[PDB]
Every structure is written in C-alpha cells, then in structure tokens.
Amino acid sequence: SGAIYVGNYRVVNRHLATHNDWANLVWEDSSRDLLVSSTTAQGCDTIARCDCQTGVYYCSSRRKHYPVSFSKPSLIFVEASEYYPARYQSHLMLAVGHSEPGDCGGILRCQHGVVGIVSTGGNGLVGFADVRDLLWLDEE
Ligand SMILES: [Zn+2]
C-alpha cells in the first residue's frame, strides 16, 4: 500500500484505488496502473522533474529503503501477479530488488523528489510506475 500526496491530488496504484478514490476521480490509466483522486487537504510530496536513473525506494515487506539504479520509463511485459494477469504495462521503470504485491505504493525518490510508486515485482526485479511526466499534478 501507499500513495503520493501532491497539492490536492492523491496518486495510488489503480488496482488499490478505493471506492472513495473512484468517486472523486481526476484521472486513471489502466495501462500505467495509476489512478489520481482529489483531496480536501494539501500533501507533503514534491514530484521529481528529471531523467534520474538512480534513487531510493521503500520496500514494506522489508521495512527498508534501498538505493537502486532503474531503467527509464517504457512499455514492458509483466508476468501474472496476484492483482493483474500477464500483460504489457506502460511508463514502467525496472530495478533489481525485492518487491511483493503488498509493496505496491512504496515511493521511489531521487534528488529531485518523488519519481514513482512500486507497481510490479517478482524474479528479483521491482517495477515502478513513473509520475514525472504528469506535469499537471503541480497546477490547478
Ligand atoms: Zn531526479
């Protein structure tokens, strides 16, 4: 579990979005595993605007933050998980590291701020849904 809170937006894994998220929907994209809902309070997070490939992610199944190198966001084939079938996912970054389904929502951060959230795992990789292209998260 986990979310990004930027302005009056809440950014979550689409597959973990609540009824309250869907009832206050700003934007969602199944191909990216992302959903953004509206919030009443303002959030503590800054979105990175950059092409960093090094950062640190939170792994709930280890209660640890790990430094990683990661690929630039791309269209990747993901094997079946407890929450999705085998499929192609867009805007996905991969790193070598530990990820279980419940790790989804952990933040990946760089020197510039929040890069994305854990979205995929298995076979010694962790996948992160990028948010750095969502420039609209910082206005309106
Ligand atoms: Zn950066």
UniProtKB/Swiss-Prot annotation:
**What positions constitute the catalytic site?**
H15 (for protease 2a activity), D33 (for protease 2a activity), C104 (for protease 2a activity)
Residues recorded as binding Zn(2+) 1, renumbered to this chain, are C50, C52, C110, H112
This enzyme catalyses:
Selective cleavage of Tyr-|-Gly bond in the picornavirus polyprotein
How it assembles, according to the record, is: Homodimer.
Q: What does this protein do?
A: Cysteine protease that cleaves viral polyprotein and specific host proteins. It is responsible for the autocatalytic cleavage between the P1 and P2 regions, which is the first cleavage occurring in the polyprotein. Also cleaves the host translation initiation factor EIF4G1, in order to shut down the capped cellular mRNA translation. Inhibits the host nucleus-cytoplasm protein and RNA trafficking by cleaving host members of the nuclear pores. Counteracts stress granule formation probably by antagonizing its assembly or promoting its dissassembly.
Q: What is the protein's name according to its record?
A: Protease 2A
Report the source organism: Coxsackievirus A16 (strain G-10)
Q: Which residues of the full protein are shown?
A: 869 to 1008 of 2193
